[PDB]
């Protein structure tokens, strides 16, 4: 009569690595590294993202006419730009503090696009119909949907002055532009004044702009330039615009709501009728594992990105079947 002491073995082919030994076959093991995603863009915590389509952030905020117009109010959990993004700034120039504005938008969860200076009542003494071939739409010269190109009316460009008081209870993002003609003949024709200036003031913003006339290499067939500026008008504050030329006046502004957990990503994945707690530019992750090797860019509640190809903890024994 005998009694023997022994240990479990099975048909498992799981392998793990240790400090002293690679490729140890074990009876039981647990994977800690998430490597699967669904290849889709999904709702994040029940909120659909903001897809910009053919526009980047600049094109959407200025209102590039080649992009499908968005609904007046949108709320989202993240912003998606496509890698193509054929449509951004269409009249060449500088977008001042553009990257700062993108960082601002990353904590924004909602916008309300409203008419800050209505077209037909704000500028009775100026021409508001200026368009350019650089911002064409359906093969016809057009202009930004949120801005107005003011030029002289009846041979005169009176000194204008308009203000807006923010009674929205939210930050209002205001965008405008400064045009720099390539020669003084165009400057005099468009704005009738050579020592023209633009002034924009609020309680914490104070800047003056002056045209700088020079002929430049043509960009999108334009030797002129258009510099774009922005500020966040605090609740209750007033913004005053003053100019005797060259102002690309605001027409629509955005009332912005602040949120948490958002950001901007680039993706060629497609929106689908799904929901996730974790979204990457390649797809959504449905997992409780502590690590993932799918993508370093994540939205929501996600596993930690690591470069490893395998992270397996042994739970059982070394597997030695007879």
């Amino acid at each position: 009569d005998t009694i023997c002491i022994g240990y479990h073995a099975n048909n498992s082919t799981d392998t793990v690595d240790t400090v002293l030994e690679k490729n140890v076959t074990v009876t039981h093991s647990v994977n800690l590294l998430e490597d699967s995603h669904n290849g889709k863009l999904c709702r994040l915590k029940g909120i659909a993202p903001l897809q910009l389509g053919k526009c980047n952030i600049a094109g959407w905020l200025l209102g590039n006419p080649e992009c499908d117009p968005l609904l007046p109010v949108r709320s989202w959990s993240y912003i998606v730009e496509t890698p193509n993004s054929e449509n951004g700034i269409c009249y060449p120039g500088d977008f001042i503090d553009y990257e700062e504005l993108r960082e601002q938008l990353s904590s924004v969860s909602s916008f309300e696009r409203f008419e800050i200076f209505p077209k037909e009542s704000s500028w009775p003494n100026h021409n508001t119909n200026g368009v350019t071939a650089a911002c064409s739409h359906e093969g016809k010269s057009s202009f930004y949907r949120n801005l107005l190109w003011l030029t002289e009316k009846e041979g005169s460009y009176p000194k204008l002055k308009n203000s807006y008081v923010n009674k929205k209870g939210k930050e209002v993002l205001v965008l405008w532009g400064i045009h720099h003609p390539p020669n003084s003949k165009e400057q005099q024709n468009l704005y009738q004044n050579e020592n023209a200036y633009v002034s924009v003031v609020t309680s914490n913003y104070n800047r003056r702009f002056t045209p700088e006339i020079a002929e430049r290499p043509k960009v999108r067939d334009q030797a002129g330039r258009m510099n774009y500026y922005w500020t966040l008008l605090k609740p209750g504050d007033t913004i005053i615009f003053e100019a005797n030329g060259n102002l690309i006046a605001p027409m629509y502004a955005f009332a912005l709501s602040r949120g948490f957990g958002s950001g901007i990503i680039t993706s060629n994945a497609s929106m689908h009728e799904c929901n996730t707690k974790c979204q990457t530019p390649l797809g959504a992750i449905n997992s409780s594992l502590p690590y993932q090797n799918i993508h370093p860019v994540t939205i929501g509640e996600c596993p930690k990105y690591v470069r490893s190809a395998k992270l397996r903890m042994v739970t059982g024994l070394r597997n030695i079947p007879s």
Binding site: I3, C4, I5, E99, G263, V297, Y305, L311, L317, S322
Partner: protein, 171 residues
């Protein structure tokens, strides 16, 4: 292994013991069979589940982490942002891979120790009433029936009950 039982003086495992990590095989006149040691297996399961949950718990959830954009005159800041992102990724990949390797070694030693201590418990109970015959097996110097088998599996082997019979068969 560190304790010499698994892949040591007990060369192989048992595919026939499906109900636990460690246990016994017996053979007497009423038959033979496997029997997992429920106490040590369950204690091992609790500790290892504890180890795995600790690894998961120590890693916080990664909340939203996206990139940033920089213009053509902010190259230094862009490289600093990249150095920060690269450096953190370096450390976490280092931490994750090492922790798994270190804990994997300890887990295998943990099972090895449990098998070794299980063998020692039986050996200390039987004394000279049975003989070590290698490969983690004991041959009794007396008739060891199913109730006597069970007394070894739990803590209650009655050594005096069989010393007289075992002493006779030892010669």
């Amino acid at each position: 292994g560190l304790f010499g039982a698994i892949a040591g003086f007990i060369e192989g495992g048992w595919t026939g013991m499906i109900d636990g990590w460690y246990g016994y095989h017996h053979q007497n006149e009423q038959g033979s069979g496997y029997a997992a040691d429920q106490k040590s297996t369950q204690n091992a399961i609790n500790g290892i589940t504890n180890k795995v949950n600790t690894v998961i718990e120590k890693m916080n959830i990664q909340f939203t982490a996206v990139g940033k954009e920089f213009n053509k005159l902010e190259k230094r800041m862009e490289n600093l942002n990249k150095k920060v992102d690269d450096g953190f990724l370096d450390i976490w990949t280092y931490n994750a891979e090492l922790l798994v390797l270190l804990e994997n070694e300890r887990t295998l030693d943990f099972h090895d120790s449990n098998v070794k201590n299980l063998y020692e418990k039986v050996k200390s109970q039987l004394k000279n009433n049975a003989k070590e015959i290698g490969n983690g097996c004991f041959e009794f110097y007396h008739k060891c029936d199913n109730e006597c088998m069970e007394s070894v599996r739990n803590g209650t082997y009655d050594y005096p009950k069989y010393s007289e019979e075992s002493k006779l068969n030892r010669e």
